[PDB]
Paper text:
The colony-stimulating factor-1 receptor (CSF1R) is a tyrosine kinase embedded in the cell membrane of macrophages. The receptor is activated by colony-stimulating factor-1 (CSF-1) and interleukin-34, and signaling via CSF1R is crucial for the differentiation, proliferation, and survival of macrophages. Unlike most kinases, CSF1R and other members of the platelet-derived growth factor receptor (PDGFR) family contain both an activation loop and a juxtamembrane domain (JM domain). In the autoinhibited form, the folding of the activation loop prevents the binding of ATP, and the JM domain forms bonding interactions with the DFG aspartate as well as other residues in the cleft between the N- and C-lobes of the protein, stabilizing an inactive form.
A protein co-crystal of CSF1R in complex with 23 was obtained using a sitting-drop vapor diffusion set-up. A complete 1.9 Å data set of the CSF1R/23 crystal was collected at the ESRF synchrotron radiation source (Grenoble, FR, beamline ID29). Inhibitor 23 binds via two hydrogen bonds to Cys-666 in the hinge backbone of the kinase: the pyrimidine N1-atom accepts a hydrogen bond from the NH of Cys-666, while the pyrrole NH donates a hydrogen bond to the Cys-666 carbonyl oxygen. Additionally, a water-mediated hydrogen bond is formed between atom N3 of the pyrimidine moiety and Thr663. The methylbenzene ring points toward the C-terminal subdomain. It is sandwiched between Leu-785 and Ala-800 and almost perpendicular to the side chain of Phe-797 from the DFG motif, which adopts the “DFG-out” conformation. Although the inhibitor binds to CSF1R in the DFG-out conformation, the ligand does not occupy the allosteric pocket that is formed underneath the αC-helix when the kinase adopts this inactive conformation, as is typically the case with type II inhibitors. Instead, the 3-methylbenzylamine moiety of compound 23 occupies a hydrophobic binding cleft formed by residues Leu-785, Ala-800, and Phe-797 termed the front pocket. The methyl group of the aromatic ring points toward the C-lobe of the kinase into a small complementary cavity in the front binding cleft. Thus, compound 23 cannot be classified as a typical type II inhibitor as its binding mode resembles that of a Type I inhibitor. The co-crystal structure of CSF1R and 23 reveals that the benzyl group of Phe-797 is folded toward the glycine residue.
Residue numbers in the entry: 547 to 684, 747 to 919
């Protein structure tokens, strides 16, 4: 599936004390439903939708501020309701981070469940990159430092998720939002996503899966770990440094594609990727999951590349 999920892991430095999806919910997040006014839809899919809203008296500082609200369609089945409560429980457990779309509140009584999160004013990274690529063909252009920042910001978010044993399962430039200062943030964006009508999501029987982004062990063996997410981050880095090309350009998803990937096929270096950045992608794409870098290793290598650019 493409929802965030806490996994049980002791390998290395992580320690699972509790799975927050196993327990009911923390009523500290409750917020008055009548103190939201809804605006336009930011996105929608099969069972859910996200709308921008103003929240009146949210948090200790009693601020008025613009937020995003996630909710199910009235047509949603119980399993969809459960999945939303699960996401709320995970987000209540993770704690805040600058590169996550943070939870701010929920409304879980007196009507349908609303999940209130930070609002990101610049929209998705992929469309941002594609507009900056388009501009080159006919304001200010991107620089290497901007692409390094985006890469670092996402890797810091992912390093945070990894430290809490949270797997993402849909890492892709389309699932990165940009907020004030064009800082990147990640979140579980499944509800905003029209997955059933998106050709990037391939039928795999029960499921619709972002196969071009997925580790071989995820595709073949239904294994889903942090190191699976590392593979996907490599695909994302390719998207960033290509200014938003579609992965595996012109290659159809089918049996030849699965065999390519299993046999060690890797996308070519993007035009705007330095060799050192391509080396991150190649490492993320190690066929053996244990030979891939950790998100912390990625973060600390990217921080060196950033210093070099600054010099
Ligand atoms: C990844 C993705 C893609 C589409 C919709 C969403 C909705 N969500 C969860 C959001 N969650 C939080 N903040 C948000 N800000 C926006 C947003 C979308 C477009 C634009 C116009 O450029 C601006 C903002 C979507 C959003 C998320």
């Amino acid at each position: 599936q493409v929802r965030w999920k806490i996994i049980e892991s002791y390998e290395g430095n992580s320690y699972t004390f509790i799975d927050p999806t196993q327990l009911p919910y923390n009523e500290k997040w409750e917020f008055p439903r009548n103190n939201l006014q809804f605006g336009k839809t930011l996105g929608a899919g099969a069972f859910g939708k996200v709308v921008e809203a103003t929240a009146f008296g949210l948090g200790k500082e009693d601020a008025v501020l613009k937020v995003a609200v996630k909710m199910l369609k009235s047509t949603a089945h119980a399993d969809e309701k459960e999945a939303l409560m699960s996401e709320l429980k995970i987000m209540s457990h993770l704690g805040q981070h600058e590169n996550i779309v943070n939870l701010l509140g929920a409304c879980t009584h007196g009507g349908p469940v609303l999940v209130i999160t930070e609002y990101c004013c610049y929209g998705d990274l992929l469309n941002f990159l594609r507009r900056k690529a388009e501009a080159m063909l006919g304001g200010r252009p991107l620089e290497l430092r901007d692409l390094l920042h985006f890469s670092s910001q996402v890797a810091q978010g992912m390093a945070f998720l990894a430290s809490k044993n949270c797997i993402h399962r849909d890492v892709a430039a389309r699932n990165v939002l940009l907020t004030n200062g064009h800082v990147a943030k990640i979140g579980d964006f499944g509800l905003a996503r029209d997955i059933m009508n998106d050709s990037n999501y391939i039928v795999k029987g029960n499921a619709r899966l972002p196969v071009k982004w997925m580790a071989p062990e995820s595709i073949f063996d239904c294994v889903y770990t942090v190191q699976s997410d590392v593979w996907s981050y490599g695909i994302l880095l390719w998207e960033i440094f290509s200014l938003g090309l579609n992965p595996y350009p012109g290659i159809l998803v089918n049996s030849k594609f699965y065999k390519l990937v299993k046999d060690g096929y890797q996308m070519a270096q993007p035009a705007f990727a330095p060799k050192n950045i391509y080396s991150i992608m190649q490492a993320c794409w190690a066929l053996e999951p244990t030979h891939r870098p950790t998100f912390q290793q990625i973060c600390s290598f990217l921080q060196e590349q950033a210093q070099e650019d600054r010099r």
